[PDB]
Amino acid sequence: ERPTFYRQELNKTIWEVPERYQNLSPVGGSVCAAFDTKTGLRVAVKKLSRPFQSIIHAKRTYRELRLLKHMKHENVIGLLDVFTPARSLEEFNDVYLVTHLMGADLNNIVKCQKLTDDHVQFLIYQILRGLKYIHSADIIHRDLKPSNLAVNEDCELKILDFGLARHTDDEMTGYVATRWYRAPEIMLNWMHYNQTVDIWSVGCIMAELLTGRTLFPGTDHIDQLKLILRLVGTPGAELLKKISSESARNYIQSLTQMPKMNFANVFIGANPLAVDLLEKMLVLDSDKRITAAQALAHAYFAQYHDPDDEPVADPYDQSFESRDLLIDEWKSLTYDEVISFVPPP
Numbered sequence: 001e002r003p004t005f006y007r008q009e010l011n012k013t014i015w016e017v018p019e020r021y022q023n024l025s026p027v028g029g030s031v032c033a034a035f036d037t038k039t040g041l042r043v044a045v046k047k048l049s050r051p052f053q054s055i056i057h058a059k060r061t062y063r064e065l066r067l068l069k070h071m072k073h074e075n076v077i078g079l080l081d082v083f084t085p086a087r088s089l090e091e092f093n094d095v096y097l098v099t100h101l102m103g104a105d106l107n108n109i110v111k112c113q114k115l116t117d118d119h120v121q122f123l124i125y126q127i128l129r130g131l132k133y134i135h136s137a138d139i140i141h142r143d144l145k146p147s148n149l150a151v152n153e154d155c156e157l158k159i160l161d162f163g164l165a166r167h168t169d170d171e172m173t174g175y176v177a178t179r180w181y182r183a184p185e186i187m188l189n190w191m192h193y194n195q196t197v198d199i200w201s202v203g204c205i206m207a208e209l210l211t212g213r214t215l216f217p218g219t220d221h222i223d224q225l226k227l228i229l230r231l232v233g234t235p236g237a238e239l240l241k242k243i244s245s246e247s248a249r250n251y252i253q254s255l256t257q258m259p260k261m262n263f264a265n266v267f268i269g270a271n272p273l274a275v276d277l278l279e280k281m282l283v284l285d286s287d288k289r290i291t292a293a294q295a296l297a298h299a300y301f302a303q304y305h306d307p308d309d310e311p312v313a314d315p316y317d318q319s320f321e322s323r324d325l326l327i328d329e330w331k332s333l334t335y336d337e338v339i340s341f342v343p344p345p
């Protein structure tokens with residue numbers, strides 16, 4: 001039945017959680033670390049801030065829950081629990097999400113230094129494993145960066161940050177990590193983008209782990225494209241046709257043409273197989289980028305690749321994305337998803 005909830009003021013909000021969650025402590029809606037006495041796990045508990053304040057917000061809330069409930073993979077963030085203190089739909093106003101407490105993100109691990117090749121193999125392998133599973137469900141991360149990759153002591157990695165509001169124009173401006181890992185087509189809105197935007201991001205991450213340095217640290221959007229094009233070459237006629245934005249295409253043709261650089265001269269001392277893979281991921285034309293499934297099969301991951309141990313996901317119905325509903329309707333849909341939740345084994 002319904003557990004007993006207890007109340008507590010933490011990060012400026014009154015948190016109301018089942019008794020099973022103890023020793024709540026703020027770590028940054030807002031988030032608390034806790035001990036789940038029922039599982040023995042240290043957990044992170046997110047209370048969503050005004051989850052139903054607008055259609056936009058109620059729909060984002062539904063998206064996040066839908067996304068988190070679908071994820072059942074070792075290398076992807078999973079939902080341990082979701083709850084509301086509410087007894088009915090009419091009383092329903094607050095949503096709490098529970099996941100594993102993560103130790104350190106990839107920024108904490110890389111920290112301005114090169115990693116050993118085997119460490120890079122292992123980390124990128126797991127990212128690609130998780131991405132294969134995510135992409136098989138037609139889900140795109142869109143925001144892959146080191147701060148969204150959490151790792152434990154054994155270097156066991158999970159992809160985080162699903163259904164978030166996604167960064168506004170102001171936090172994509174300037175010399176910012178929020179933009180350095182974004183594919184060019186999505187950074188400058190060239191065209192309708194596909195799953196391989198995430199592969200660009202993996203390339204940027206993998207290069208950073210190899211060299212200890214941000215690959216494309218642009219001071220702004222234009223600076224960044226210039227760094228990108230200096231490495232990968234200016235686009236050919238084939239790709240230009242695909243840039244459906246006429247203004248964007250017009251700006252590209254203004255730039256002095258440049259050939260693709262020799263990656264072995266850029267990533268000096270690196271595994272030739274790492275270099276080869278980097279070249280296949282950092283392809284300007286998204287149509288020609290390596291997929292997660294293809295990259296897992298690349299010779300660079302010979303020691304980890306197991307086709308029988310790289311599962312796909314169940315189908316994810318996202319028809320709701322193109323649906324127009326009122327706040328109360330997204331709220332009722334969200335409520336059904338809270339009450340129907342079945343905890344992992």
Ligand SMILES: C[C@@H](CS(C)(=O)=O)Nc1ncc2cc(Oc3ccc(F)cc3F)c(=O)n(C)c2n1
Pocket residue numbers: 027028031032044045046068077078079080097098099100101102103104105149150
């Ligand atoms: C000390 C840090 C290391 S870090 C930043 O993960 O690298 N630990 C940690 N662990 C897990 C989360 C989960 C978060 O968000 C959630 C997402 C889905 C949920 F179901 C529940 C959540 F709380 C979150 O916002 N933070 C800040 C977290 N922090």
